Amino acid sequence: RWIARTFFDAPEKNYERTMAILQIESEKAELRLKELEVRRLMRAKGDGPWFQYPTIDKALIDHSPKATPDN
Amino acid sequence: NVWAKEPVLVASFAIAGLAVILPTLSPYTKYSLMINRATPYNYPVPLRDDGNMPDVPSHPQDPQGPSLEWLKRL
Numbered sequence: 461r462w463i464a465r466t467f468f469d470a471p472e473k474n475y476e477r478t479m480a481i482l483q484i485e486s487e488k489a490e491l492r493l494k495e496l497e498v499r500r501l502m503r504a505k506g507d508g509p510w511f512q513y514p515t516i517d518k519a520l521i522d523h524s525p526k527a528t529p530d531n
Numbered sequence: 532n533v534w535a536k537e538p539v540l541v542a543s544f545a546i547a548g549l550a551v552i553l554p555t556l557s558p559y560t561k562y563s564l565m566i567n568r569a570t571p572y573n574y575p576v577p578l579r580d581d582g583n584m585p586d587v588p589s590h591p592q593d594p595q596g597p598s599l600e601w602l603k604r605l
Contacts, residue, residue, distance in 0.1 A: 510587040 562601070569599045 502508035533541050552558065578587070588595040 525573075527573040 565599070565601070 498508075499510070503511050506512070586596065
């Protein structure tokens with residue numbers, strides 16, 4: 461009884477530690493699988509803000525009266 | 532000094548230094564930019580009628596527009 465009193469831990473302490481720790485890592489695993497599914501559909505269709513390789517910037521396209529009428 | 536050692540090099544450095552410095556101090560550089568700007572290569576296009584501008588004259592004889600005169604006035 462003295463050994464359990466001065467050194468060891470209650471099963472309540474360890475049990476709730478296990479339960480909280482499973483909650484944490486279940487969040488981690490669900491976010492990881494959701495991450496890779498979001499990544500594969502976002503590479504497939506391209507609608508998302510990740511895989512957008514830079515196209516032409518149209519600010520340099522400056523329409524104006526040219527020399528030749530038929531451009 | 533250096534005028535007796537290599538004179539043509541010193542003369543070249545002097546005329547080069549005035550070629551660097553001298554185009555700043557001149558009464559003609561703004562005249563150069565005006566002469567060079569105001570020559571029309573392409574067609575000066577007409578544009579849409581009115582935003583009620585007190586500019587853009589409807590006749591090429593009308594003096595309401597920005598024209599050049601200092602070609603003839605030296």
